[PDB]
């Protein structure tokens, strides 16, 4: 009876792999970026990186390589899932759309191998003879490459070399030959083998086995003109080819291990290298063209180019530009320049890509303060460590406000020698109209003086021929920019009112009852051109430039999207979309390389269409925004700008990949709006509602607005303290032993350039190498508005902070920052000494209140019921805040890393392996072990849904829920709890916490962050929702196409090295929200028995507004 639900709140942003090649067409420079379950394809264009198609697989991309075999049109992509799903792909844009055909596929797991240190390796032959795998120790797998092997078949060779580091296929050999670095006793070596796919055996390799560096970590396939292999160790870079052998050992390298490499030239004369310190080297193979026209290679030279961010992938694109794929921090784009312009860095940043990095910890705050919170995470490691403030939805920041009561229109107006800055704002009430005169921000209105007084203005703009028009319920009126007086007016033939109004720079389309009149703006005159009465009564008009071929309309009778020319009123189309309530707003504008038609029903729904303008032919989809007539309007932030959707749920339609973005606005309700670039509020927007008249600015192009706070060090834990109006963050930096026997700063990080910056000097202990890297932990008092390191309190040497708490204890009025540490000596791996320290941020100082000496590692701790629950090594103590402010102490026996508290005296502890359930009783101060879990799990996170639902996540990228068993005898069968939920996420969860990003039928909300920068939400479903969506899952696998032909069943299965179970009690909207992206024949194959399309399309539309 545990029915949960997981959605992606943010795609994984870390970059794990990136390759270059010709994938779309021939000479189509593609950049293929691997995130986790996502695959991104780009085309190098003048613009920069422009994508073609972002696909999504049911697996964790572990091997990604490109190649086109003998006689192929374009390169064939190859991908291997970490769960051992192989597939060859092919970009095929034969039609106007894009489809990734799956030429081949096949699972290549071995029932009898052990995954090896340094993980999976996927190598491909230089001439596309075979794919080579190194999944398990001592087993090299071969997959021959022909055409009939479409069901990817494979066979294993045996590898006498047991511990293998890195393998590569050598260029220019008589047949497939392999070069690798393997380890055994007596250091590690490099051996050569020949793969013989005719006898399925290993043959003695081209050259002798050499001894190499002890820490050789990478092998580089050197191209044809030179041939050989380059081996990158920690301190010596060596070149091996037969008897030839070169090697250079620059001390410039040892400081950090080289991690990645990328080939620059096709010749291989130049290579790019990357440090964990964030460097970027250029490895050189200098040439020596001899007498006999041949080329040879003479020496190696490595010289530093500068520093990028810490790179896990590396890739030269084109024109001296390199894409830096960062896993610990922001991926970026980099230009390498011959002239080192500034300092010594030949490296210049061009673009950075938001990477939420390894999310170590996070917390939810109401920084905006309605109901919608913002996530503040601890992203990145080392120099790329930052804080990320995920704000959800387009937001504004108001600059002024005026108590108005019920406006019915907003219009900018310019009434002066044109300064290019609007100086007049004109409002309209149900009848009365008041032309606000605002040289500054004034209230007092002077009707700039011909505009109508109490008749309720429908349009008020700046028409061409340097004049100013006003459409109202009396007449259209032209006030001039020559004497500034009423010079022209179009009364009505029957002398009756105007209903609809539509005006641009030089045209005017008005409507009376059923009639449609056309007017053209000329100096001091209003000219009549067209004239027609429609079939039905006019409800809404739109014209869009100062001359429009088309004129869109909405009628009062049949909800007819009708398009008309203007020099006459010839009908060009009508749509079969008849509702029952009137269309209220209509608009047509240009977003990107297209022309869309928009229409707003009175019920709250909106349609969008596409078309050109040489014929009136037009993409029905009932997108629902608010519940009240949504008044549309175009607005102008930059030049390429979008439309504003005034409603009680203000949406904004931006341009995506030349499609639709629908981002809510963090305001309660808006009825009317218009842009404003004023000589007093420049580039502001005027927002009207039923109350105030705000004025402010705008933020973002899509949903999230991610604020960044660079820390330049590693942030570990985070808390929020409202009484101090500031955050609390624990963080560690790296320091290397100097020539003096102490440490040093690598780079000026945040803790070292803090405002206060105190230290410790606490004698609590009484019972030292050189050239090392030591950690130094601090407590950062980040401020919550002007993120800055107010205070940075430093701990003792060899003391690592591991837990952070911001709470009140006992009946003490003060709110404290409680920090629990652990003494780490670089020798014995389970700490024996620790500390729990209680601080207070009084004003500008960080007082040390109390200090309970502790012997053990304080892994985690949480406020419990005014008591300080703490986890020390294998003991779970319950402390208590003494009136003397001493925190006196109360027992279990278990290694708790993670610790949560529902309340009600019930606890959650993890990790001797599995989960436990403990209860406190006002009885003895001691806990009772209610019911634990026995099947083991190497876990990494914990959370509570309710009293009988406990969320787990373990080192294996799976989720699972525990629940107290209800079996026969409560004597023991209750003393256990089973796993009513199993689920494979593919992400490495680090932290669970409660809250929702949206301001908020389905119960619950738990957010989690992951190493790949992915953010997800967990909810709960009644037994009528779970069984609806469960059968909606087991019917969507049949009607959705998998990129690798990987059955969704297999992807979600609980996978470990031991129990491979099916999923239960879990539902992923990432597989169910996609149901809104299919055709109706398919979409109605899932919904037939047990219910139609319009009864799921708009039900799921509620299930996307949970995150």
């Amino acid at each position: 009876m545990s029915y949960n639900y997981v959605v992606t709140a943010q795609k994984p942003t870390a970059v794990n792999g990136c390759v270059t090649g010709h994938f779309t067409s021939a000479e189509d420079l593609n950049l293929l970026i691997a995130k986790n379950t996502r695959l991104e394809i780009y085309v190098v264009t003048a613009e920069g990186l422009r994508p073609v198609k972002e696909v999504g697989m049911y697996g964790k991309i572990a091997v990604m390589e490109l190649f086109r075999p003998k006689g192929e049109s374009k390169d064939l992509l190859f991908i291997l899932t970490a769960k051992y799903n192989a597939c060859i792909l092919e970009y095929k844009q034969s039609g106007e759309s894009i489809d990734i055909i799956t030429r081949a596929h096949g699972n290549v797991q071995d029932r009898i191998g052990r995954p090896s240190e340094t993980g999976i390796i996927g190598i491909i032959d230089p001439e596309c003879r075979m794919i080579g795998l190194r999944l398990y120790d001592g087993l090299f797998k071969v997959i021959p490459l022909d055409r009939d092997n479409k069901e990817l078949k494979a066979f294993n060779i045996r590898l006498e070399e047991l511990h293998v580091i890195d393998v590569k296929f050598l260029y220019g050999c008589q047949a497939p030959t392999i070069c690798f670095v393997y380890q055994d006793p007596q250091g590690r070596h490099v051996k050569t083998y020949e793969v013989s796919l005719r006898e399925k055996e290993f043959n003695k390799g081209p050259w002798k086995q050499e001894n190499v560096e002890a820490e050789a970590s990478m092998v580089i396939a050197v191209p044809e003109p030179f041939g050989g292999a380059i081996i990158i160790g920690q301190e010596s870079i060596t070149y091996h080819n037969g008897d030839k052998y070169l090697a250079i050992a620059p001390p410039i390298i040892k400081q950090s291990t080289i991690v990645c490499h990328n080939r620059v030239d096709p010749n291989g004369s130049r290579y790019l290298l990357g440090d964990m310190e964030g460097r970027l080297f250029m490895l050189l193979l200098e040439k020596e063209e001899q007498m006999d026209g041949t080329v040879t290679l003479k020496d190696l030279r490595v010289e530093l180019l500068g520093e990028t961010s810490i790179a896990e992938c590396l890739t030269y694109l084109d024109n001296g530009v390199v894409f830096v794929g960062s896993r610990l921090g922001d991926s970026q784009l980099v230009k390498l320049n011959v002239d080192s312009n500034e300092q010594g860095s030949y490296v210049v940043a061009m673009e950075t890509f938001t990477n939420l990095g390894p999310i170590v910890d996070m917390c939810v705050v109401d920084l905006e303060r309605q109901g919608q919170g913002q996530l503040v995470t601890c992203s990145g490691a080392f120099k790329e460590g930052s804080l990320r403030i995920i704000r959800n939805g387009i937001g504004i920041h108001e600059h002024a406000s005026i108590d108005l009561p019920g406006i019915k229109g907003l219009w900018p107006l310019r009434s002066d020698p044109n300064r290019e800055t609007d100086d007049t704002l004109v409002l309209s009430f149900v009848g009365q109209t008041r032309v606000l005169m605002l040289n500054g921000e004034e209230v007092e209105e002077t009707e700039l003086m011909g505009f109508v007084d109490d008749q309720q203005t429908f349009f008020c703009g700046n028409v061409a021929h340097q004049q100013l028009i006003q459409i109202t319920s009396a007449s259209v009126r032209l006030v001039s920019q020559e004497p500034k007086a009423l010079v022209s007016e179009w009364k009505e033939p029957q002398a009756k009112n105007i209903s609809v109004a539509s005006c641009n720079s030089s045209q005017v389309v008005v409507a009376v009852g059923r009639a449609l009149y056309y007017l053209q703006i000329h100096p001091q005159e209003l000219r009549q051109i067209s004239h027609t009465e429609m079939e039905h009564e006019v409800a809404c008009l739109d014209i869009t430039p100062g001359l429009s071929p088309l004129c869109a309309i909405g009628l009062w009778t049949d909800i007819s999207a009708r398009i008309l020319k203007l020099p006459s009123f010839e009908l060009l189309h009508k749509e079969m979309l008849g509702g029952e309530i009137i269309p209220r707003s209509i608009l047509m504008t240009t977003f990107e390389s297209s022309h869309y038609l928009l229409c707003a029903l009175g019920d709250g729904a909106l349609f969008y269409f596409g078309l050109n303008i040489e014929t009136g032919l037009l993409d029905r989809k009932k997108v629902t925004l608010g519940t009240q007539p949504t008044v549309l309007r175009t607005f102008r932030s930059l030049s390429t700008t979008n439309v504003f959707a005034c409603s009680d749920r203000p949406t904004v339609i931006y341009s995506s990949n030349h499609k639709l973005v629908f981002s809510n606005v963090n305001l309660k309700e808006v009825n009317y709006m218009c842009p404003l670039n004023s000589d007093g509020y420049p580039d502001s927007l005027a927002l009207a509602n039923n109350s105030t008249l705000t004025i402010g600015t705008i933020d973002e192009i899509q949903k999230l607005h991610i604020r960044t706070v660079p820390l330049y060090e590693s942030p570990r834990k985070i808390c929020y303290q409202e009484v101090s109006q500031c955050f609390g963050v624990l963080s560690s930096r790296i320091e290397v032993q100097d020539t003096s026997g102490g440490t040093t700063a690598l780079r000026p990080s945040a803790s070292t350039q803090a405002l206060s910056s105190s230290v410790s000097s606490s004698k609590l202990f009484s019972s030292t190498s050189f050239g090392e890297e030591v950690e130094v932990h601090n407590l950062l008092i980040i401020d919550q508005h002007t993120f800055e390191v107010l205070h940075a309190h430093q701990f003792l040497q060899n003391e690592y902070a591991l837990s952070l708490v911001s709470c009140k204890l006992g009946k003490d009025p003060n709110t404290y920052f409680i920090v629990g540490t652990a003494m780490v000596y670089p020798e014995e791996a389970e700490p024996k000494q620790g500390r729990i320290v209680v601080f207070q941020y009084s004003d500008g100082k960080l007082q040390t209140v109390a200090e309970k000496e502790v012997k053990g590692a304080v892994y985690s701790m949480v406020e419990f019921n005014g008591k300080l629950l703490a986890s020390i090594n294998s003991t779970v103590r319950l402390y208590e805040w003494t009136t003397e402010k001493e925190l006196r102490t109360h027992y279990n026996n278990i290694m708790a890393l993670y610790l949560k508290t529902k309340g009600d005296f019930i606890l959650v502890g993890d990790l001797m392996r599995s989960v436990l359930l403990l209860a406190y009783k006002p009885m003895e101060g001691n806990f009772e072990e209610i019911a634990r879990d026995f099947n083991p799990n190497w876990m990494s996170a914990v959370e509570i849904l309710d009293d009988d639902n406990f969320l787990g996540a373990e080192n294996a990228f799976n989720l699972f829920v525990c629940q107290k068993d209800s079996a026969a005898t409560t004597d023991e069968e209750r003393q256990h709890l089973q796993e009513v939920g199993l689920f494979h996420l593919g992400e490495f969860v680090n932290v669970f916490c409660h809250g929702s990003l949206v301001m908020q039928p389905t119960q619950g909300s738990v957010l989690f962050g992951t190493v790949n920068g992915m953010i997800g939400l967990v909810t709960s479903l009644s037994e009528s929702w779970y069984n609806l969506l469960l059968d909606m899952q087991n019917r969507l696998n049949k009607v959705i196409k998998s990129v690798g032909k990987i059955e969704h069943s297999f992807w979600r299965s609980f996978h470990t090295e031991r129990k491979t179970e099916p999923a239960t009690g879990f539902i992923d909207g990432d597989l169910i929200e996609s149901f809104l992206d299919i055709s109706r024949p398919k979409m109605q194959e899932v919904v037939a028995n047990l219910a139609t399309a319009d009864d799921l399309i708009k039900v799921v539309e509620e299930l996307t507004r949970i995150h």
Binding site: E27, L29, V44, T45, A46, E47, G48, V264, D265, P266, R270, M282, L284, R301, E303, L305, Y316, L317, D318, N319, G320, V321, L336, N337, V338, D339, S340, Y346, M350, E351
Partner: peptide
């Protein structure tokens, strides 16, 4: 001025000159 930065690969020149 770097020696080893003269003449980076150029597959197309109008390929990256907008930014």
């Amino acid at each position: 001025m770097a020696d080893f930065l003269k003449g980076l690969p150029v597959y197309n020149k109008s390929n990256f000159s907008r930014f």
